[PDB]
Design a protein around this ligand. Sequence first.
Ligand SMILES: [Cl-]
Ligand SMILES: [Cl-]
Ligand SMILES: [Cl-]
Length: 180
Amino acid sequence: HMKSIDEQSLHNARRLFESGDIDRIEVGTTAGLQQIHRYLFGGLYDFAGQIREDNISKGGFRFANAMYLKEALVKIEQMPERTFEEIIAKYVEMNIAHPFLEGNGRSTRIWLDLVLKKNLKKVVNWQNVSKTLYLQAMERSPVNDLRLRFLLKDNLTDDVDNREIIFKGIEQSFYYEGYE
Ligand SMILES: [Cl-]
Ligand SMILES: [Cl-]
Ligand SMILES: [Cl-]
């Protein structure tokens, strides 16, 4: 049957890697995040790659106000990346920013992995990170990122070019957002 947006965006994420285009994106920047989002969602959402002007919330959590989101992003992208701790802190702030109307989770996990790969030569082996544990670590992270740090640290891999880790990790990442 016709592909859904989630199904086609999953195909687009696989192609981002298969084509090599993944390694031609800026790492750790707002623009690089926009490039990922545009790759995943171009042709699917009208706002692919575009910083939102509206507010958004999920449960009782409101993401950064659109009113100062651009300003927040400039500071976020300048955060340092030389240790695991620093990289997770930068990711936590980019998650709080949540700069698109949709597609933040999936795009920003790819963004995180590129920062880890550049600076540590590791990525997250997402297939082994349970949805429940991931979502509760993320819910705690604005106040206390320790649970998230340890969860992700225990699931790092140095096998950053392995197809199965990459493709199963895309699958898992999309499953965090409800798609299987
Ligand atoms: Cl806030
Ligand atoms: Cl910090
Ligand atoms: Cl998402």
